[PDB]
Design an enzyme around this catalytic site. Structure first.
Site, PDB file in Angstrom:
ATOM      1  CG  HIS A 202      -2.049  23.595 -19.081  1.00 19.29           C
ATOM      2  ND1 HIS A 202      -1.921  22.898 -17.616  1.00 19.29           N
ATOM      3  CD2 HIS A 202      -3.462  23.127 -19.403  1.00 19.29           C
ATOM      4  CE1 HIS A 202      -2.893  21.878 -17.570  1.00 19.29           C
ATOM      5  NE2 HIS A 202      -3.691  21.865 -18.576  1.00 19.29           N
ATOM      6  CB  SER A 206       6.065  20.323 -15.964  1.00 21.21           C
ATOM      7  OG  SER A 206       5.135  20.951 -14.981  1.00 21.21           O
ATOM      8  CE  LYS A 228       8.868  13.188  -6.322  1.00 28.61           C
ATOM      9  NZ  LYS A 228       9.713  12.415  -7.637  1.00 28.61           N
ATOM     10  CG  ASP A 229       2.845  18.072  -5.236  1.00 24.99           C
ATOM     11  OD1 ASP A 229       4.073  18.216  -5.271  1.00 24.99           O
ATOM     12  OD2 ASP A 229       2.216  18.278  -6.123  1.00 24.99           O
ATOM     13  CD  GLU A 272      11.560  40.485   7.603  1.00 24.27           C
ATOM     14  OE1 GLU A 272      12.175  40.211   8.722  1.00 24.27           O
ATOM     15  OE2 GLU A 272      10.420  39.653   7.512  1.00 24.27           O
TER      16      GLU A 272
END
Ligand SMILES: CCCCCCCCCCCCCCCCCC(=O)OC[C@H](COP(=O)([O-])OCC(O)COP(=O)([O-])OC[C@@H](COC(=O)CCCCCCCCCCCCCCCCC)OC(=O)CCCCCCCCCCCCCCCCC)OC(=O)CCCCCCCCCCCCCCCCC
Ligand SMILES: CCCCCCCCCCCCCCCCCC(=O)OC[C@H](COP(=O)([O-])OCC[N+](C)(C)C)OC(=O)CCCCCCCCCCCCCCCCC
Ligand SMILES: CCCCCCCCCCCCCCCCCC(=O)OC[C@H](COP(=O)([O-])OCC[N+](C)(C)C)OC(=O)CCCCCCCCCCCCCCCCC
Ligand SMILES: CCCCCCCCCCCCCCCCCCCC(=O)O[C@H](COC(=O)CCCCCCCCCCCCCC)COP(=O)(O)OCCN
Ligand SMILES: CCCCCCCCCCCCCCCCCCCC(=O)O[C@H](COC(=O)CCCCCCCCCCCCCC)COP(=O)(O)OCCN
Ligand code: HEC
Ligand code: HEM
Ligand code: HEM
Ligand SMILES: CCCCCCCCCCCCO[C@@H]1O[C@H](CO)[C@@H](O[C@H]2O[C@H](CO)[C@@H](O)[C@H](O)[C@H]2O)[C@H](O)[C@H]1O
Ligand SMILES: CCCCCCCCCCCCO[C@@H]1O[C@H](CO)[C@@H](O[C@H]2O[C@H](CO)[C@@H](O)[C@H](O)[C@H]2O)[C@H](O)[C@H]1O
Ligand code: FES
Lengths: 383, 71, 61, 244, 124, 111, 85, 54, 55
Positions: A202, A206, A228-229, A272
């Site tokens: 922060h 970003s 948008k998410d 896995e």
């Protein structure tokens, strides 16, 4: 002053989810952050519910999972949701790390969120490995055996440490009960680190796909990235639905539906799918200890990206040579994954070694070389 | 009587004829080789499993749908 | 290019009936449908998921 | 690995339940239970299935209670603390043929017949593997195969030598619904039954998935309209620059 | 890496006739394929600025240059979010791709590197 | 034949080795062996190969009779053990451990 | 490095006029058909090599490796397998 | 159509009430409709289709 | 956590697990101390008016 800004607690929420200033040009690969948060929430909800029905004692564990599948209302869904979301968690985490590598999110000033992220990645692996053991099917037991015996490679104390992890002389009840307790805990530790890497991020905000500053043009996190998410949330849930409801066992190993049998060793023990590339790197080195170090180094080497990328430009959007190299690196990582599940036979033995060499040489040789050369090409090219 | 028997025979004589003949020729060779003495003290004993698999795999491709349609 | 009172061309995007109630109502119908399916989907999720806590089939026997 | 070591991989048969919108054929399930009960149950347990699980799937409550009540199960001890048996109830699990592993192996020349509750999920191939294995005993082993003693040749089983002999022959079962009990018919039915045993939620799961897919698709479509709607001010933004 | 390093190395290449003959054409094609000009950026707009040195260099830009840089970044950000490319006058032509910032950062770094050297001096 | 006896949850391989098996094991030059040992050192009775049947690499149980040295093959990372249960090929560092076993009778051993 | 609204840490801006219209005034899907076809083709064409080259190379490598492996464990490949081990 | 906006949409209290009532209606009718559709595509296969024999 | 084993598992902790007795007693007793301290803390807050504005 508005309440959301005045009140200390609301203001912390506000700073992260509402007024948080974001670059206005984030593309869909910035959506994996929120999908990983969604996976984390689904895993917590389904996991805590499974914990209400599961019994950690080895005499009852496998049967308790069958009881969840057969007797508990919607148990089938909760179990499949938990197991499939583990796979989706890794798809999204690789996507997120892929985004970060391609767009140079690891460069200054974001080395700290990157470095905390590498720890989150290790914790995810440990969480998911322990959770797999809790079923106590054949793959559960044999996976635990193989992976815990890697600690035997630690010189002098290795053997003693393995017996200490197991709580005994082999993987058994003590191991399963301790894995239950840790598997329950580890996701909370993981959530703390996830939150720390956000707090670390922060300060810089970003990155964005151009790799230039966004200080010139910011957008509130809500409503723009909120809505948008939602698109990727519904895209994710569609993929979730197709697995969970229509093909719930596509991503699983059939051998895990056979109860653990310490006598019989299964035909092929593979981890896995999401651990397979690291498994291939381990197989590539013939030495026991070498293999373990290589395997760990394949994750910890991510920590040096801030150093070995010598570029004066952040990220690959504008760097054709770096983009090609990145493409080959990613495809090699998928090849390693595939070599993790083939039989140890010619010619895959040699191939596995070459892919392992390519994996490490990206960090140690090619990225430093290529990034130095592209610096020069941008300068001379634009004179 | 068992519908599979007829469908399998038809698929062997028809679309999987090359593989049928390969398996047959294999069997002939191996039986002949077993007939000969000091076969038990040989290093490599040839089988017909591979040819059998090729044939069965082929028969199954040409039969699966047809068989389940008549049950 | 120079005058800031000459608003750039928005004609490719402007709706002619932009101030009508029909116009707003349409967009809210989309928002509301999405809220309606989210409500119905949430209720279904919650109901089915929490039912895990009601007596299992072996207990009901 | 050699193909032999892997086992021949079974064909993809068109099962009724294959298909996103398809349930099991419950008539087939019922027939397959009868094959389990008259053939497989001699060697194979079905320990995760209770009598109550058959009810409203293959049998009515009455038929299933009748099957339970024909057996004896361990009761709580009597008042002198002596062991007692009781007749079975719907909550009871279908009992196995052997008391323990050692007894099971002794009856099968050392091989242990697996519990079949999960076998459809526990093998690559599922229904197809069970069908292929039961129907895939050749008359004669391919020339040159050396079987270990007490093994039978079956190409679908990895390694080829399986401790289970061919058991389905035309008319070993007399179906109660008048269906001709051919080897293929019985294998198909029992394979379907065992598939149900492994995943009894199958029918309900796929129906809920249909509901989920529909609603999730609609929400995805609407979320795209809403995103585009809310973002249009940002996308449509225009600038005029006059250097100062 | 430092802009100083990039600039020095580039000067070594441009000096050597052989080297320049093979590198200059490559670098020109690289820049064409890089495609930053298609978003109306100048090369120097792409340089990472979140370092104290680069913040200082940016503060030293003449007001006009500074205001225009902000415009090119805003314009490019809008092209990026729209998934459009620049057209016409918005595309950077090769003649407009001037190194407006390189002299400022070279001076900032020169002093910072001198400072590091002089912090390590030993009276002989 | 090779038996598997559980002892402390770990499997114990007991092989009843034939004469010619013993011979095959006694051949390999000790020199070329990650863990240099001959059969004589391993077994206290050449007819009773008693081992802790857990692979010395990471701890799978080798599938017996399989391999490339036709003893035991660990499927996990492809390490091949011998008829002595010595490591020949693959990542495994040591030969298959021998527990403390004594022949109380000639027909019964304790572990 | 980043501030907050009101002191974000932009260099001073001057001389840019920004214009936009209300979301209710705009058609959200204006020119969607043209974009979905022409714009996506443009963006895909320009990135195609960076995907095709590594994908095709690694798929070819895998194909060669898997085919050799399959062939070594046939009868025909007995000798080559014996040498490889 | 102004009237429709004014009644159901203008007040958020009203809009949320309308959305939840619609969700209730949708939930009940969708359930019934899928049940019928699922029974038609899986006709003669389900227990309810063979139950009558017993 | 299974009711057939829970009580016995606690006895197993008391008797078999190394220092199990201490870990179990520590956990059980600290539950008591937790309440003593929480009542003390709330008592402090009530007496000294920690509940008033601005807290
Ligand atoms: C998992 C859970 C499911 C949830 C879904 C999340 C996935 C969303 C995501 O991040 O990817 C969508 C993503 C759309 O993101 P976007 O915001 O339109 O553009 C991001 C890039 O800048 C797009 O790059 P661009 O603007 O250069 O456009 C390139 C793209 C065209 O992009 C599209 O619009 C599609 O075409 C390709 O690169 C395709 C490769 C050609 C081979 C044939 O699609 C891609 O970018 C695919 C290319 C990846 C390689
Ligand atoms: C498979 C191979 C992928 C190679 C990618 C090359 C770039 C490309 O074409 O992608 C499209 C786009 C190109 O976007 P861009 O941002 O470079 O360009 C946008 C348009 N211009 C250049 C005009 C500004 O790249 C991405 O969006 C890349 C995201 C990377 C995610 C990778 C996940 C892999 C997981 C492995 C983890 C370890
Ligand atoms: C997961 C739970 C799903 C709950 C959503 C169901 C109802 C709420 C809804 O649709 O919100 C619409 C409403 C209204 O959306 P709106 O805020 O765009 O509408 C306001 C303007 N009028 C009233 C004129 C239409 O949103 C909220 O009130 C936020 C709550 C969402 C949670
Ligand atoms: C899953 C279910 C999806 C969420 C359902 C929300 C209801 C949607 C309709 C309601 C709506 O649009 O109104 C907004 C509510 O959205 C909101 O306030 C939330 C916006 C979107 C919520 C999701 C945010 C990111 C999703 C990703 C998950 C994050 C990871 C953590 C798990 C108000 O807001 P407005 O400003 O548009 O109102 C404008 C005037 N008041
Ligand atoms: C925790 C795991 C989250 C994953 C959710 C996806 C689907 C799970 C829902 C369960 C399910 O099968 O529901 C079906 C409908 O799906 C749907 O319609 C659900 C999909 C909707 C997407 C999720 C939207 C919100 C979900 C999360 C919110 C939960 C908390 C907030 C209050 C049909 O089941 P049914 O219709 O028979 O059910 C009875 C009511 N008629
Ligand atoms: C009298 C003995 C016997 C009968 C009858 C029998 N089985 Fe088996 N079955 C076995 C034994 C023994 C094995 C173990 C084979 C092995 O591991 O070598 C086995 C194995 C299996 C396996 C698993 C093979 C594997 O992949 O491990 C399936 C599935 C199976 N049986 C299904 C059936 C079905 C379905 C029936 C009849 C409808 C049936 N069996 C009848 C003895 C029997
Ligand atoms: C639980 C796992 C994780 C969660 C929930 C998570 C979540 C997020 C979120 C929400 C963001 C901001 C939005 C975004 O860029 O997508 C973000 C950014 C970031 N994450 Fe993660 N993350 C996780 C794991 C990781 C890992 C494993 C790494 C690195 C190895 C990582 C490195 C970063 C970095 C560097 C950023 C800044 C990227 C940027 O915006 O440019 N994260 N993460
Ligand atoms: C990051 C979060 C998590 C991940 C990645 C994760 C992963 C897994 C995995 C991979 C399994 C094996 C699944 C299977 O094949 O059946 C599993 C099982 C399990 N997990 Fe988790 N898990 C997480 C969180 C949790 C949490 C918070 C709990 C809370 C207790 C939990 C409880 C369980 C239980 C009880 C099982 C065993 C039952 C089962 O297999 O389904 N998990 N988990
Ligand atoms: C993600 C889920 C939602 C919950 C929030 C996440 C929990 C983490 C919050 C605690 C971490 C501290 O978070 C820190 O708080 C303060 C104020 O709240 C922020 O401070 C920022 O916002 C406020 C106003 O909004 C300004 O006074 C300040 O100039 C600015 O830097 C920091 O940028 C943030 O780093
Ligand atoms: C704050 C929230 C308020 C409290 C939340 C209440 C929690 C639980 C409420 C209902 C739980 C059980 O309620 C029951 O749900 C299940 C679905 O899950 C429904 O069951 C229906 O669907 C399921 C599968 O979806 C089928 O197996 C079943 O045959 C069918 O009847 C019942 O018709 C309902 O009676
Ligand atoms: S586990 Fe035995 S070879 Fe690696």
């Amino acid at each position: 002053m508005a309440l959301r800004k005045k009140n200390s607690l609301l203001n912390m929420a506000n700073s992260y989810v509402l007024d948080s200033p974001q670059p206005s040009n984030l593309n869909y690969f910035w959506n994996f952050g929120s999908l990983l948060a969604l996976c984390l929430v689904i895993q917590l909800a389904t996991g805590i519910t499974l914990a209400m029905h599961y019994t950690s004692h080895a005499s009852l564990a496998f049967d308790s999972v069958e009881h969840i599948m057969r007797d508990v209302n919607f148990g089938w869904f909760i179990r499949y949701a938990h197991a499939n979301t583990a796979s989706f968690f890794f798809i999204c985490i690789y996507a997120h790390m892929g985004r970060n590598i391609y767009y140079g999110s690891y460069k200054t000033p974001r080395v700290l969120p990157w470095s905390i992220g590498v720890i989150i990645f290790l914790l995810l692996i440990i969480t998911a490995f322990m959770g797999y053991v809790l079923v106590f099917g054949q793959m559960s037991l044999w996976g635990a055996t193989v992976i815990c015996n890697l600690v035997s490679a630690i010189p002098w104390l290795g053997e003693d440490i393995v017996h200490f992890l197991w709580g005994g002389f082999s993987v058994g009840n003590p191991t399963l009960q301790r894995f239950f307790a840790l598997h329950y805990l580890m996701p909370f530790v993981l959530a703390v680190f996830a939150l720390l890497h956000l707090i670390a991020l922060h300060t810089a905000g970003s990155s964005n796909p151009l790799g230039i500053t966004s200080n010139v043009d910011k957008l509130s996190m809500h409503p723009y990235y909120s809505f948008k998410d939602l698109i990727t949330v519904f895209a994710f849930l569609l993929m979730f639905t197709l697995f969970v409801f229509f093909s719930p066992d596509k991503l699983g190993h059939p051998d895990n539906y056979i109860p653990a049998n310490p006598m019989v060793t299964p035909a092929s023990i593979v981890p896995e799918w999401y651990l397979l590339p690291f498994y291939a790197i381990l197989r590539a080195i013939p030495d026991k200890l070498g293999g373990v170090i290589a395997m760990v180094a394949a994750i910890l080497i991510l920590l040096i990206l801030p150093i070995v990328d010598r570029s004066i430009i952040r990220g690959n959007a504008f760097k054709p040579i770096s983009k090609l190299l990145f493409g080959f690196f990613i495809c090699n990582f998928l090849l390693l994954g595939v070599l993790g599940q083939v039989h140890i036979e010619p010619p895959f033995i040699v191939l596995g070694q070459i892919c392992t060499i390519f994996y490490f040489s990206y960090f140690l040789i090619l990225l430093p070389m290529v990034s130095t050369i592209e610096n020069i090409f941008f300068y001379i090219g634009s004179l | 009587p068992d519908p599979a028997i007829a469908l399998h025979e038809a698929a062997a004589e028809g679309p999987c004829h090359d593989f049928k003949h390969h398996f047959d020729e294999c069997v002939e060779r191996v039986t002949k080789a077993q007939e000969a003495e000091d076969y038990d003290h040989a290093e490599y004993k040839e089988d017909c499993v591979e040819e059998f698999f090729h044939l069965q795999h082929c028969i199954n491709d040409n039969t699966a749908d047809k068989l389940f349609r008549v049950l | 290019g120079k005058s800031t009172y000459k608003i750039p061309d928005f004609t490719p995007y402007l709706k002619k009936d932009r101030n009508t109630d029909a116009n707003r109502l349409f967009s809210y119908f989309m928002i509301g449908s999405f809220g309606m399916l989210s409500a119905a989907g949430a209720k279904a999720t919650v109901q089915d998921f929490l039912s895990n806590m009601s007596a299992s089939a072996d207990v009901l026997a | 690995m050699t193909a032999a070591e892997h086992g021949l991989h079974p064909a993809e048969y068109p099962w009724p339940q294959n298909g996103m919108l398809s349930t099991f054929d419950h008539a087939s399930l019922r027939r397959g239970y009868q094959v389990y009960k008259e053939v497989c149950a001699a060697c194979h347990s079905l320990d995760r299935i209770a009598w109550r699980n058959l009810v409203g799937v293959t049998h009515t409550t009455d038929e299933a209670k009748a099957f339970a009540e024909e057996l004896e199960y361990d009761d709580e001890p009597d008042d002198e603390g002596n062991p007692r048996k009781r007749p079975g109830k719907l909550a009871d699990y279908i009992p196995g043929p052997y008391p323990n592993e050692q007894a099971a192996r002794a009856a099968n020349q050392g091989a242990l017949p697996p519990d079949l509750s999960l076998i459809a999920k526990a093998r690559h191939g599922g229904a197809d593997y069970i069908f292929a294995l039961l129907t895939g005993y050749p008359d004669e082993p391919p020339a040159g195969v050396v079987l270990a003693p007490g093994m039978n040749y079956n190409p679908y089983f990895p390694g080829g030598g399986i401790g289970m002999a061919r058991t389905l022959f035309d008319g070993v079962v007399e179906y109660e619904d008048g269906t001709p009990a051919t080897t293929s018919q019985m294998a198909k039915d029992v394979a379907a039954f065992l598939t149900w045993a492994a995943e009894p939620e199958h029918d309900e799961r796929k129906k809920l998935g249909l509901k989920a897919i529909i609603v999730i698709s609609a929400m995805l479509g609407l979320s795209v309209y809403i995103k585009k709607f809310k973002w249009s001010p940002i996308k449509n933004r225009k600038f005029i620059y006059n250097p100062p | 890496a430092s802009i100083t390093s990039v600039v020095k190395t580039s000067e070594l290449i441009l000096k050597s006739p052989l080297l320049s003959k093979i590198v200059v054409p490559l670098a020109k094609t690289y820049v064409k394929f890089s495609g930053y000009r298609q978003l109306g950026f100048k090369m120097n707009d792409l340089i990472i600025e979140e370092t104290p040195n680069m913040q200082l260099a940016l503060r030293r830009l003449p007001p006009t240059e500074s205001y225009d840089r902000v415009y090119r970044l805003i314009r490019a950000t809008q092209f990026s979010l729209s998934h459009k490319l620049a057209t016409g006058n918005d595309i950077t032509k090769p003649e407009e791709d001037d190194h407006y910032l390189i002299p400022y950062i070279l001076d900032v770094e020169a002093e910072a590197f001198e400072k590091d050297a002089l912090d390590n001096l030993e009276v002989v | 034949k090779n038996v598997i006896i559980k002892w402390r949850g770990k499997p114990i391989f007991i092989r009843h080795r034939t004469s010619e098996e013993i011979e095959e094991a006694n051949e390999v030059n000790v020199a070329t062996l990650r863990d240099p040992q001959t059969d004589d050192e391993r077994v206290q009775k050449p007819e009773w190969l008693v081992m802790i049947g857990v692979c010395t690499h990471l701890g799978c149980v080798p599938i017996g009779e399989a391999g490339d040295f036709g003893g035991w093959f660990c499927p996990c990372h492809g390490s091949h053990y011998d008829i002595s249960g010595r490591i020949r090929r693959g990542p495994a560092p040591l030969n298959l451990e021998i527990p403390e076993y004594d022949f109380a009778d000639a027909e019964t051993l304790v572990i | 490095y980043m501030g907050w609204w009101g002191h974000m840490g932009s260099p001073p801006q001057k001389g840019i006029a920004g214009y936009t219209i209300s979301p209710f005034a705009a058609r959200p899907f204006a020119g969607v058909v043209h974009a979905a076809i022409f714009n996506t083709f443009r963006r895909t064409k320009n990135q195609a090599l960076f995907v095709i080259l590594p994908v095709s190379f690694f798929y070819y490598v895998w194909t060669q490796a898997s085919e050799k492996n399959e062939w070594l464990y046939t009868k025909a490949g007995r000798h080559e397998l014996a040498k490889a081990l | 159509a102004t009237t429709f906006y004014n009644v159901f949409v203008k007040r958020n209290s009203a809009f949320v009430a309308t959305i939840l009532a619609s969700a209730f209606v949708f939930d009940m009718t969708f359930e019934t409709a899928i049940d019928n559709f699922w029974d038609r595509i899986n006709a003669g296969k389900q227990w309810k289709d063979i139950r009558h024999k017993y």
